[PDB]
């Protein structure tokens, strides 16, 4: 049995190195080992990728023609990294030059006015580039807020919450934003009724209590969905951090019309792990898709930023797959130097940055994190049951489609350490320097 | 809602350091958070206990009447560690004198001609001493080796295996020995087939193919037990390593006659953690016990190894029960100063050891660890759901059958860490030093 080795040493600046490897029949001993069993299947994945928010668009509208080729076939080459997922917003969110909504009157409204003009320049010449790189992407449309005169507060920020009887005209925007896009070629697979529903930002954000928001979903977004034949459509609650997902999930699907109409749970990693939130709704919804639906870090200087960076992309990925997630969508895909545009000046670093000037485009640890994953498994795959000898030796298994293997290790400690990935009685003895990540690619016999 | 917060330094050496404490209503905040929900229970667990060997009822047996006395109340007492779990060997292990079998030949057993002299002198006082303290200790007897001439090498160590033609009498040298001990007033409740049936030991061992296994179980040992009215007896199987608790487990319930006699399968931990293992089984096989019968750290004098030892023993038994675990059993409960007696010089530490030359018992920090859940946890207590927002601070949550919660709390990171318990509405704020425990006990209001 052989296979195919990509190892990353960020200490030395090296990523994704890769070699062939191969098996040796598996010793006696049976200590320092990752064990892998690929005939115990667990839960399917559906892909990996980034969002595109108006800043990204922005950033990206001003690349050289020559760097938007490279930009692009870097993220949806199937040669690179192959990303098959993303998010984008439904009106404004902070990555944006500004508030912005497709209609901001009850008179334009009543005259049926709206407006898309403004995601037609920076947002649809992005999509649309990747589309061209890969057609088959799943795209998936959050709001942040409804228009302002639609709130209680008369505000897109600072919170506030849809009025009730903007409801249906809240959910007929949606339909609308739904087939401006198809008609510029770009088809929506996946909503989730509002980005943090519990949370007031200083920027773009929109209150839902649990009942409010599976309610805009099954009694108002479904039903106009079927009539335009969008049956298929999924849809996600939730859509924020990882310690209230039980709480919300109970409360929601305690309701048998909501248990029909949603499809699963979006959620972020801004309040840490909780990985054990994700595995019991994994076990009492085996039905349902828990999706990691956006995440990123600050923009930090210190020596140690990028190291840290990539221990919390890749940590927090591991653990989300090992827990029964099934698909991780990284916040922007690209923005500029500084970690910007954003209206409300909250910066952010994102896997590329791009500075106009110099017409550099660079690329961040984490953009190489998400690579041990992404570049490797497909739509489809489904994580393999896998055990450490120890919890430092993170590790996640997949088995892709065609039968392919897949195993991730990183190695948190702040030593070289070893490890032997057995697969029943072959294995293959592996050694990581600290913060070293390695995918392992290999077949059956 | 208030509640008794147990905290323990393991460097600074203050150990279960109680004081009263009380919970205040949430802030909004949700960030280092450790959520509990009590109201999700997951599987229950039998207890806590160490083990009785040979090499321990002699050391035992050495003790002065007073320091008998205080090594009895330290383990067994009610308001100590309130052991409620046992295991103890059916004929010799490495912490023993030297090999003994009950029995040295075919025509001995044929007359009735065993001996239980050395279990008499070495065994029973000891466990006589702890039933008393607590007559309703939970018992469990696992042999390292049958007699030498029912095995194909003709000898107690390095491996061989029992001869199919020695299969009932091998199992009647089992009911002699529960009978021997029932007429001591000693009364057993689980067995474990074989210890470590796939190793081969310099010291007492036998090989059992899982066939081999699971056929002595129910085919040899269940119409016997059931004969003479133990057929409430519980069998435990593998009786070894994580890392092939899968395998063994999938092959053994694959057949019906074995998933109906046989209770669930053992385990150890010296080939690491492989806490997925655990989880898989606790899912497929949910009516089964996973217990963790026997573990134990060498003996070594270096710089910090008390806080290694102290650190193995809690981060082992947090990832079991939080991975689906129904109980903790350590190894020896008591040894000599050197980590003796051994017959083979496997040399180890217990949590308490005596020193014969000045009559002087030490408690290592390994006692203080265990303590940190066994004081405080009851038989039949389930494990509650809880996550934490990094896995760096571990944690297990309990529910005792009173309704009485019971959080254990370990910081593994180098440095002081703060947390949140948050218990619906309501929280806790805690910090923890490095490699700082703390147990949290409260009621619902």
């Known amino acids: 049995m052989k296979g195919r080795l990509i190892s990353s040493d960020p200490y030395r600046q090296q990523f994704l190195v890769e070699r062939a490897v191969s098996f040796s029949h598996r010793q006696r001993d049976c200590s320092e080992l990752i064990s892998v069993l690929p005939r115990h299947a667990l839960q399917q994945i559906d892909g990996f990728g980034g969002s595109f928010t108006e800043g990204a668009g922005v950033v990206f509208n001003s690349m050289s023609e020559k760097t938007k080729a490279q930009f692009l076939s870097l993220y949806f080459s199937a040669q690179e990294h192959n990303y098959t997922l993303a998010r984008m917003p439904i009106q404004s969110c902070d990555f944006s030059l500004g508030n912005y909504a497709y209609v901001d009157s009850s008179a334009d409204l009543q005259q049926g006015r709206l407006s898309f003009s403004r995601d037609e320049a920076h947002l649809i010449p992005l999509i649309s580039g990747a589309l061209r790189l890969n057609p088959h992407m799943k795209l998936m449309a959050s709001p942040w807020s409804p228009p302002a005169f639609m709130k209680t507060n008369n505000d897109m920020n600072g919170g506030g919450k849809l009025r009730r009887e903007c409801y249906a005209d ?43 928001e599976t309610a805009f979903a099954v009694q108002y977004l479904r039903p106009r969905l079927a009539r335009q034949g969008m049956d298929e459509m999924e849809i996600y609650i939730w859509d924020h951090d990882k310690d209230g997902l039980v709480d919300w999930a109970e409360l929601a699907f305690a309701d048998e019309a909501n248990y029909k109409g949603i499809n699963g749970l979006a959620f972020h990693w801004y309040t840490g792990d909780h990985f054990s939130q994700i595995q019991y709704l994994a076990q009492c919804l085996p039905d349902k898709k828990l999706l990691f639906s956006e995440g990123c870090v600050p923009m930090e200087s210190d020596a140690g930023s990028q190291i840290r960076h990539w221990h919390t992309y890749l940590h927090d990925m591991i653990g989300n797959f090992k827990s029964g997630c099934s698909g991780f969508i990284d916040w922007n895909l690209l923005l500029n130097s500084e970690g910007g545009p ?92 600290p913060s070293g990540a390695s995918t392992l690619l290999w077949r059956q016999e």
């Open 342 to 433: 954003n209206h409300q000046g909250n910066l952010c670093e994102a896997p590329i940055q791009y500075d106009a000037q110099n017409d550099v485009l660079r690329r961040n640890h984490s953009w190489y994190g998400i690579g041990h994953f992404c570049r490797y498994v497909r739509p489809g795959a489904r994580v393999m049951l896998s055990s450490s000898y120890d919890n430092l030796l993170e590790e996640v298994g997949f088995v892709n489609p065609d039968g392919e293997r897949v195993l991730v290790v990183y190695n948190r400690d702040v030593q070289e350490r070893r490890c032997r990935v057995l697969d029943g009685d072959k294995e293959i003895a592996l050694t990581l320097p």
């Open 170 to 212: 809240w959910a007929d925007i949606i339909i609308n934003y739904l087939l401006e896009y198809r008609r510029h070629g770009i088809n929506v697979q996946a909503l989730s009724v509002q980005n943090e529903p519990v949370a007031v930002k200083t920027w773009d954000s929109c209150l839902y209590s649990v009942e409010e």
